[PDB]
């Protein structure tokens, strides 16, 4: 099943370390997040096909990207993202050009592998209040680098179209 739910509340596999309400309405602070394949809030999204990456990029990613659930990867960050109406109205070439040619999303992110594992979920098509649920996990040694990655991405042209962003920092129980 390709659907995942993230329930903020009193139970779950992850302890909430902090929530940073970066842009737009935040998410209520809670004790834990419960993740279900299939309390104060619920987010959901689905795993899907590639929308932007080209073969040579997938090959580079596959050579270095780590798996989820490494024993060492006791920290995670859930980052729900919404992009603007102007973004979604653009054509596929226009969006690819912003994503990679101008913002270097994949090339920059590759600089943080193999430290950081990731998962991308989609939810605009479900009618959710965010467009994406992005998930990252890593060992503590990579926290500083991950915080640097976030600031680099927020400086990019792609991020001019981000209208809501929340960081939910987690620790594996």
**Residue numbers belonging to the annotated binding site:** 51-53, 83, 105
**Smallest distance from a second copy to CB 128, Å:** 11
Query: In the complex, which residues of this chain contact ligand HEM (CB under 6 A)?
Result: 50-53, 61, 79, 81, 92, 105-106, 109-110, 112-113, 116, 118, 120, 132, 134, 136, 149-150, 153
- Tell me how far CA of residue 33 lies from CA of 12, 95, 158, in angstroms: 5, 32, 28
**Smallest distance from ligand HEM to CB 7, Å:** 21
**Smallest distance from a second copy to CB 122, Å:** 7
Q: Could you give the CA distance from residue 99 to residue 119 in angstroms, rounded to a whole number?
A: 17
CB atoms within 10 A of CB 117: 19
73 contact, one of ligand HEM, a second copy, none, CB 5-8 Å limit per kind: none
153 contact, one of ligand HEM, a second copy, none, CB 5-8 Å limit per kind: ligand HEM
Select 25 or 127, whichever has its Cβ closest to a second copy.
127
**Smallest distance from a second copy to CB 146, Å:** 26
Residue 36's DSSP bridge partners are 5
Query: In the complex, which residues of this chain contact a second copy (CB under 8 A)?
Result: 1-3, 46, 48-55, 57-58, 88, 90-94, 96, 122, 124-125, 127
Annotated binding-site residues for heme b read: 51-53, 83, 105
């Amino acid at each position: 099943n390709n659907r995942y739910s993230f329930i903020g509340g009193r139970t779950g596999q992850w302890q909430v370390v902090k929530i940073r309400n970066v842009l737009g309405p935040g998410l209520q602070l809670v004790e834990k997040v419960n993740i279900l394949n299939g309390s104060a809030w619920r987010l959901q999204g689905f795993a899907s096909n590639i929308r932007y990456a080209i073969r040579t990029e997938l090959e580079a990613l596959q050579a270095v990207q780590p798996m989820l659930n490494r024993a060492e990867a006791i920290l995670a960050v859930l980052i729900p993202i919404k992009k603007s109406a102007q973004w979604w109205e653009m054509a596929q070439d226009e969006r690819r050009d912003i994503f990679e040619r101008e913002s270097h999303h994949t090339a920059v992110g590759l600089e943080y592998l193999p430290g950081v594992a990731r998962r991308l979920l989609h939810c605009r098509d479900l009618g959710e209040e965010f467009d994406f649920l992005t998930w990252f996990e890593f060992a503590p040694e990579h926290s500083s680098a991950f915080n640097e990655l976030l600031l680099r991405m927020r400086a990019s042209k792609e991020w001019e179209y981000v209208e809501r962003e929340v960081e939910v920092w987690l620790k594996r129980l």
